Amino acid sequence: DIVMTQSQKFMSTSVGDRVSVTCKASQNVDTNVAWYQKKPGQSPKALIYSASYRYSGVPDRFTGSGSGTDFTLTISNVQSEDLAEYFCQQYNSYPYTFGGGTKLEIKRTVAAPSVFIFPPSDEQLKSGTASVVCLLNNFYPREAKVQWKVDNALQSGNSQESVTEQDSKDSTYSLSSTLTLSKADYEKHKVYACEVTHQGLSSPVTKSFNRGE
């Protein structure tokens, strides 16, 4: 039960700043500690070995330090591509154990979302179901509100939404919301709209279409 404790679950930094991720070993592990970087949707990538030795191809901005029980991964000149979860690991004694991980968040300027709407496909309509998709592209900060309106009536309880992880190139977020009705209920109304509220907008943005072009 050699526990690797990373007290910082999340850390906010800016492009160009320096961030230090700490790793706490419950027992002495000398310098037998490695550091991993877990990008979203990818496999873990080994950054540092022997507490302070970087891998072939790892940039010089990633520096590791520590001995015994206190270890530190330092990321200087933080780039937007550095968005990932960082895990420490001891390999001094079995069983090998990983830290809880530290998620790196990057703060950037406010960016308003680009709002797009997709009517249900003809393929889906023949199946008896109609899904309308509202897309919010490349906004910051992450907080945003989507409201569905059908014939100017606010919808409730018939939609699901999800937000992406922070983008590795521009540090923005994206959001997709789906309004799903039966085909019978879909053909009963005319105007479908998603109303978007975001810090980058001075007024709610409405994206709509009329059923039947």
């Binding site: 080994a46 154990t97 990983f98 496909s121």
Partner: protein
């Protein structure tokens, strides 16, 4: 060079068994220690065990001893993770890792294999186009995508143009519908000027249901 390819996503019943594979290419595994680790929502990254395919010696985490058995076949350059008496807590992404020893930590990782322990049956998704239109274009760019609706379990893999299209792609996290089925969307922004000359195909794989779909997303 060295590439680790793991078996596809699985859906297993409670108390059943599953055998995951990790085939190495471009490197004889007799020079390696092969590791298996798992990732769970709460427990984080957990070391499972290690095998030396040169002699078959295995070192396990005593918490999973008996439930996990790692073997290797040097002829196929393939290592295996056999999981027995699967409980609901065994749902995780299982990674295989390869190390030589000169830099001396897991430097080559597989893509991972998602194993879902559940009594519910698999369901293959429908794949619908999110067609580019005047309502998804602005500033010379067009948004298009694919709606992967009503499947179980996670995960679903989405690529665009067989992997040739990666810029501007957003594959959103899946949402859990009331029925217990999942849905996700994958979108990409492209030049509106070339919608008539370029072809955009989303490639959707859902391994537990043997679903492999290539949906062409046409404008209008």
């Amino acid at each position: 060079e060295v590439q680790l390819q793991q078996s596809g996503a699985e859906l297993v019943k409670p108390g059943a068994s599953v055998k995951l594979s990790c085939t190495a290419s471009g490197f004889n595994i007799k020079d390696t220690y092969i590791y298996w680790v798992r990732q769970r929502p709460e427990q984080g990254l957990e070391w499972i065990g290690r095998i030396d395919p040169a002699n078959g010696n295995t070192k396990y985490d005593p918490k999973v001893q008996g439930k996990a058995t790692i073997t290797a076949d040097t002829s196929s350059n393939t290592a295996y993770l056999q999981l027995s008496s699967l409980t609901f807590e065994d749902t995780a992404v299982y990674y295989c890792a390869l190390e030589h020893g000169y830099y001396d930590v897991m430097d080559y990782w597989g893509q991972g294999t998602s194993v879902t322990v559940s009594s519910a049956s698999t369901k293959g998704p429908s794949v619908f186009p999110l067609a580019p239109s005047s309502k998804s274009t602005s500033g010379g760019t067009a948004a298009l995508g694919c709606l992967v609706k009503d499947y179980f379990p996670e995960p679903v893999t989405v690529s665009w143009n067989s992997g040739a299209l990666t810029s501007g792609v957003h594959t959103f996290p899946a949402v859990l519908q009331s029925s217990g089925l999942y849905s996700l969307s994958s979108v990409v922004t492209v030049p509106s000027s070339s919608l008539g000359t370029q072809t955009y195909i989303c490639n959707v794989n859902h391994k537990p249901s043997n679903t492999k779909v290539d949906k062409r997303v046409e404008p209008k």
